[PDB]
Design a binder for this molecule. Sequence first.
Ligand code: HEM
Ligand SMILES: N[C@@H](Cc1c[nH]c2ccccc12)C(=O)O
Length: 403
Amino acid sequence: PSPLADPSIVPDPYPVYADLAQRRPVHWVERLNAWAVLTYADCAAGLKDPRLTADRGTEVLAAKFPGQPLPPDNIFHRWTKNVVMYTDPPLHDALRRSVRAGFTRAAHQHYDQVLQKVAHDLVASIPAGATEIDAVPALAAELPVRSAVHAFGVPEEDLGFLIPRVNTIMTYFSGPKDQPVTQEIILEKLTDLHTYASELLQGMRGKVLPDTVIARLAAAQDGLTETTPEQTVHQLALVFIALFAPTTPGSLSSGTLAFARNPRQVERFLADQACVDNTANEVLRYNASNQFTWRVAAKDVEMGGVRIEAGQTLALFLGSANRDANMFERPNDFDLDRPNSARHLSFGQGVHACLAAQLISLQLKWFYVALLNRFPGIRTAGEPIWNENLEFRSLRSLPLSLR
Ligand code: HEM
Ligand SMILES: N[C@@H](Cc1c[nH]c2ccccc12)C(=O)O
């Protein structure tokens, strides 16, 4: 029976992952209804294997809410089948092209400057007399909200509608434990996000700041030719879920803990620009916020000495891959000088590689620039406490002393 279903692994899964990567690199996890895949080689290839489909909403819903299927007209199915995350090419590619305007090279030039300033302002807001802070609420949870506002364009006045709704939806992704919120309530909130997205574009909600992702997407709508207005609304709902997910806070807080525990890495960061430039990637490698991602077998595949049959579900453990010593020597070292940190799988790989990958790497870079030049002496001031979630793993508390 799999140690991956043991909630006690969440604060430090890596010794278990390393053991299983060696002995049981692909094996069954009954509480996921899926094959766990633990090695870098199998995860990286699996993400790019056309025999594995992204079309998995039915299967994953069956794993998480067995006995509660939904018909094709249901919001869950209409949403999953019309967003990039859960579609294969060709539809995937039409959907991804439809959001290009938010993510161009020129847009990222602008986002670079915004995120520099936003991170600057955050860190500069910490009062002079502060030696102690809980870096989760104060920083890790805060920066992504400020980025949502200033870079993505989510109206600040609408955050009270969005943040609790995305928190509720995200309980879908609670890993191999009981679902804390009923399916019925998740679907209500998913529906609410579609109503909000549609109304936002119509000008019935808040005011979207100019030159942000959402402003650029709004302006692109008249010229779209291969996708529908419903499809924009589905895609915006996915964007809000991703923007307010614990992914970005987890990356920020786990990287902050890494620096706090590895002061010589602070020294490296402050000495060498190449170590700044590698910070986002080494932070993302060190702890994947999304520790596993789902796939379904569209055809039979053989992985890790196991024949997986068409129709079976797979859990690709990105978090284990990232610490596989066969790819990353001394994988438990947080090392800014590591030469291949960019090879991490925290954003996935291939067709579905994170749409926001550069946005988030900018956010991380600028955060650590601001934080570590202000407070190079960061250290722990108590025990970091993790959320009870393997699937989207993040710190709930990170007590620090800043000097
Ligand atoms: C540190 C923060 C983040 C992490 C760790 C993360 C991670 C990931 C991962 C692992 C995937 C691929 C999943 C798979 O193929 O199974 C992905 C895809 C995606 N990400 Fe993110 N991401 C984050 C932030 C964001 C944000 C803020 C957005 C808002 C736009 C976003 C939008 C997306 C989209 C739309 C996809 C799907 C791309 C496609 O299917 O072509 N991500 N991300
Ligand atoms: N791992 C998710 C996809 C995903 C990646 N990043 C996310 C952020 C928020 C919600 C879901 C996602 C899945 O298999 O379904």
